[PDB]
Amino acid sequence: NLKIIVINLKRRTDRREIMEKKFQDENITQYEFFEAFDGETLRPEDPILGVFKHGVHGLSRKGVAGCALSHYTVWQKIAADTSGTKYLVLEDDINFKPNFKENLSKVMKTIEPSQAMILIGMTVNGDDVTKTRDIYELDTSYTIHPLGRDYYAGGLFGYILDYRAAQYFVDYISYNGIRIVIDYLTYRSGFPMYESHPHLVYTVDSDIQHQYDRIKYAIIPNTYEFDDYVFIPNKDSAGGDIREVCADIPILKNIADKDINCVAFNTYGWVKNNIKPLHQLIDIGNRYYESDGIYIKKNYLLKEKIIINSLNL
């Protein structure tokens, strides 16, 4: 049956105790705490941070990043469970509307097979709170609807999902890194989302909103050699970009593999459709890796090589 996961910082034993007491009052015994990534203690050299290494600096805020890692890690776990078991993921500061246990039960019973991602709470646009009280607050049907995308102002504090949604989110990140705050990431991912009527949970004490310090990434070893690419350390081809992803070489290499139009990627996280002549590559210093540089597809270079060597120079 339903697995409940509560994302909780080890240090927030206050929040943990509150949640445990809430579950007791609801007679819910089937839950577990996920030990949340503490943004404060994330190590600058930890390779898991690769997903955040790009030009959207807001994602490097310690609390923002820790939160993102926590949901993402939970998704990896859920993604692995292809049994189809349902998970309810909660944050550790939520409130239950009265008769939570009964209401959740009714909602669960109503779920159809295609409803893989369901918000049972969300932040509603301030301007839309009044006009959506009928569907979100006052409703007594306990039914599941397409997400009201026009009303959405964030929230992964209460959602029911299975491996299908989790795997999709995980896949999205493998092609994008984490360039969007984690709740908006699900919203922008293109995965179909649903909602309960009414909402079952709702949410000021915050380990995120007042932390503006960013993780300062340590330079980490570049131990990556690939059969299909030549690596040129400390050189780049400015421009000719498809897009920026994130400074994570395995992620980048895979993206480059899958894209016929991609001829090169740099370790800063740019995947490129055009590069300059090699003699026109510019110098780039180590920012993320020892060494940073550019990977170029061998097939591209081999074509050039054959032709250039044939020429009467």
Q: Where do contacts with ligand UDP occur on this chain (CB under 6 A)?
A: 7-9, 36-39, 63, 66-67, 70, 91-93, 206-209
List 9, 66, 93, 289, residue binding Mn ion (CB under 5 A) = 93
Give, in order, the Cα–Cα distances in Å from 91 to each of 5, 170, 263.
9, 19, 42
Residue type, 165: A
Let me know: does 114 contact 146? Beta carbons within 8 Å: no
Is the Cβ of residue 62 or residue 197 nearer to ligand UDP in the bound state?
Answer: 62
Is the Cβ of residue 106 or residue 298 nearer to a copy of itself in the bound state?
Answer: 298
**Least Cβ distance, residue 118 to ligand UDP (angstroms):** 18
Is the Cβ of residue 19 or residue 249 nearer to Mn ion in the bound state?
Answer: 19
With CB under 5 A as the rule, give the number of residues binding Mn ion.
1
Rounded CA separation 305/296 (Å): 13
**Least Cβ distance, residue 207 to a copy of itself (angstroms):** 9
Which stretch, 93-101, 115-123, 159-167, 263-271, contacts Mn ion (CB under 5 A)? 93-101
> CB under 5 to 8 A by kind: which of Mn ion, a copy of itself, ligand UDP, none does 279 bind?
none
**Least Cβ distance, residue 67 to Mn ion (angstroms):** 9
Structure tokens at 281: 């590559």
Which stretch, 10-18, 88-96, 129-137, 162-170, contacts Mn ion (CB under 5 A)? 88-96
Is the Cβ of residue 72 or residue 142 nearer to ligand UDP in the bound state?
Answer: 72
Is the Cβ of residue 117 or residue 220 nearer to a copy of itself in the bound state?
Answer: 117
Could you check whether the bond before residue 291 is cis, i.e. omega within 30 degrees of 0? yes
Residue type, 50: G
Rounded CA separation 117/74 (Å): 14
Buried b / exposed e over 188-219, threshold 16 CB at 10 Å, is ebebebbbbbbbbbbeeeebeeebeebbebee
Longest dimension (CA), the chain: 86
**Least Cβ distance, residue 105 to Mn ion (angstroms):** 25
92 makes contact with Mn ion (CB under 5 A): no
> CB under 5 to 8 A by kind: which of a copy of itself, ligand UDP, Mn ion, none does 214 bind?
a copy of itself
Reduced 3-state DSSP string for 229-277: EEEEECEECCCCEEEECCCCHHHHHHHHHHCCCCCEEECCCEEECCCCC
Applying CB under 5 A, the residues found at the interface with Mn ion are 93
